[PDB]
């Protein structure tokens, strides 16, 4: 259960893609 935040520090892959 990862947060969903998609932003170019954060990594999609792996969290919320």
Same mark, same amino acid.
């Given at each position: 259960? %990862? !947060?969903? =935040?998609? /932003?170019?520090?954060? =990594?999609? !892959?792996? %969290? /919320?893609?």
């Amino acid at each position: 259960a %990862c !947060k969903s =935040t998609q /932003d170019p520090m954060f =990594t999609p !892959k792996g %969290c /919320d893609n």
